[PDB]
Protein backbone atom coordinates (compact mmCIF):
# COMPACT_ATOMS: atom_id res chain seq x y z
CA UNK A 1 0.00 0.00 0.00
CA UNK A 2 0.93 3.73 -0.82
CA UNK A 3 -0.09 6.04 2.19
CA UNK A 4 -0.93 9.60 1.83
CA UNK A 5 0.72 12.30 3.89
CA UNK A 6 -2.07 12.26 6.40
CA UNK A 7 -3.69 9.08 6.03
CA UNK A 8 0.38 8.05 7.99
CA UNK A 9 0.64 10.65 10.48
CA UNK A 10 -3.03 9.47 11.59
CA UNK A 11 -1.69 6.09 11.67
CA UNK A 12 1.43 7.05 13.20
CA UNK A 13 -0.85 8.71 15.81
CA UNK A 14 -2.43 6.37 16.79
CA UNK A 15 0.50 4.03 17.87
CA UNK A 16 2.24 6.69 19.51
CA UNK A 17 5.02 8.17 17.65
CA UNK A 18 4.25 11.56 18.42
CA UNK A 19 6.86 12.96 20.45
CA UNK A 20 8.08 9.13 21.20
CA UNK A 21 11.70 9.94 22.57
CA UNK A 22 11.61 13.48 21.75
CA UNK A 23 10.51 13.47 18.18
CA UNK A 24 7.56 15.11 16.91
CA UNK A 25 5.04 12.76 14.66
CA UNK A 26 6.72 15.54 11.51
CA UNK A 27 9.82 13.53 11.60
CA UNK A 28 8.03 10.30 11.60
CA UNK A 29 6.53 10.95 8.48
CA UNK A 30 9.23 13.03 6.72
CA UNK A 31 11.77 9.57 7.70
CA UNK A 32 8.47 7.65 5.61
CA UNK A 33 8.78 10.26 2.72
CA UNK A 34 12.45 9.89 2.45
CA UNK A 35 12.98 6.24 3.05
CA UNK A 36 10.17 4.52 1.00
CA UNK A 37 8.04 7.18 -0.22
CA UNK A 38 5.14 6.16 2.14
CA UNK A 39 4.94 2.22 0.31
CA UNK A 40 5.20 -0.40 3.04
CA UNK A 41 6.42 -2.73 0.17
CA UNK A 42 9.41 -0.89 -0.22
CA UNK A 43 12.57 -3.59 -0.35
CA UNK A 44 16.33 -2.62 -0.63
CA UNK A 45 18.70 -4.90 -1.37
CA UNK A 46 22.36 -3.55 -0.65
CA UNK A 47 25.42 -5.37 -1.72
CA UNK A 48 26.31 -5.86 1.93
CA UNK A 49 23.85 -8.99 2.36
CA UNK A 50 21.43 -6.99 4.55
CA UNK A 51 18.15 -5.81 3.15
CA UNK A 52 16.09 -3.08 4.02
CA UNK A 53 12.55 -3.67 4.68
CA UNK A 54 9.17 -1.95 4.44
CA UNK A 55 7.76 1.63 5.02
CA UNK A 56 10.93 2.83 7.50
CA UNK A 57 13.55 0.90 5.75
CA UNK A 58 14.36 -1.41 8.79
CA UNK A 59 17.54 -3.24 8.39
CA UNK A 60 18.13 -6.65 8.15
CA UNK A 61 21.67 -7.16 9.88
CA UNK A 62 20.74 -5.52 13.04
CA UNK A 63 16.41 -5.28 13.84
CA UNK A 64 14.68 -8.21 11.66
CA UNK A 65 15.23 -11.61 10.38
CA UNK A 66 15.27 -12.78 7.04
CA UNK A 67 17.31 -15.69 7.66
CA UNK A 68 19.94 -14.73 4.95
CA UNK A 69 21.77 -11.89 6.41
CA UNK A 70 25.44 -12.34 8.53
CA UNK A 71 25.66 -11.38 11.73
CA UNK A 72 21.64 -11.17 12.44
CA UNK A 73 20.78 -9.63 15.51
CA UNK A 74 16.85 -9.70 15.29
CA UNK A 75 16.76 -7.30 18.18
CA UNK A 76 12.90 -6.53 16.94
CA UNK A 77 12.33 -10.44 17.21
CA UNK A 78 10.72 -10.10 13.96
CA UNK A 79 10.46 -12.05 10.42
CA UNK A 80 11.49 -9.50 8.23
CA UNK A 81 8.74 -10.31 6.37
CA UNK A 82 6.08 -8.49 9.34
CA UNK A 83 7.80 -5.35 8.00
CA UNK A 84 5.81 -5.46 4.86
CA UNK A 85 2.57 -5.67 5.69
CA UNK A 86 -0.08 -2.90 4.93
CA UNK A 87 -0.92 -2.54 8.66
CA UNK A 88 2.34 -0.23 10.00
CA UNK A 89 1.75 -1.64 13.57
CA UNK A 90 4.99 -4.36 13.47
CA UNK A 91 7.15 -1.57 11.86
CA UNK A 92 6.03 1.23 14.19
CA UNK A 93 6.61 -1.01 16.97
CA UNK A 94 10.40 -2.00 16.05
CA UNK A 95 10.94 1.08 15.01
CA UNK A 96 10.01 2.00 18.69
CA UNK A 97 12.95 -0.06 20.01
CA UNK A 98 15.43 1.09 17.51
CA UNK A 99 15.07 4.32 18.43
CA UNK A 100 15.33 3.60 22.17
CA UNK A 101 18.53 1.37 21.89
CA UNK A 102 20.80 4.34 21.55
CA UNK A 103 20.71 5.67 18.47
CA UNK A 104 17.70 8.47 18.06
CA UNK A 105 16.64 8.62 14.52
CA UNK A 106 20.02 9.27 13.01
CA UNK A 107 19.75 5.45 12.65
CA UNK A 108 17.80 6.52 9.50
CA UNK A 109 19.84 8.17 7.22
CA UNK A 110 16.82 9.62 4.89
CA UNK A 111 15.99 11.12 8.50
CA UNK A 112 20.18 12.88 9.08
CA UNK A 113 20.29 14.07 5.28
CA UNK A 114 16.59 14.97 4.34
CA UNK A 115 14.48 16.13 7.66
CA UNK A 116 16.84 16.81 10.24
CA UNK A 117 16.92 20.75 10.61
CA UNK A 118 13.94 21.19 8.57
CA UNK A 119 10.38 22.46 9.69
CA UNK A 120 8.84 19.05 9.35
CA UNK A 121 5.97 20.25 11.12
CA UNK A 122 4.93 20.70 7.40
CA UNK A 123 4.55 17.39 7.11
CA UNK A 124 1.67 17.20 8.99
CA UNK A 125 0.26 20.56 8.38
CA UNK A 126 -3.82 20.49 7.73
CA UNK A 127 -4.04 16.94 8.71
CA UNK A 128 -6.81 15.36 11.01
CA UNK A 129 -5.22 13.47 13.47
Given at each position: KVFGRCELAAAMKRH???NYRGYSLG???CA???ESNFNTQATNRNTD???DYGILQI???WWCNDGRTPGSRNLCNIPCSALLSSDITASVNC???IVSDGNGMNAWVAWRNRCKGTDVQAWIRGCRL
Open positions: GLDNWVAKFGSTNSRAKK
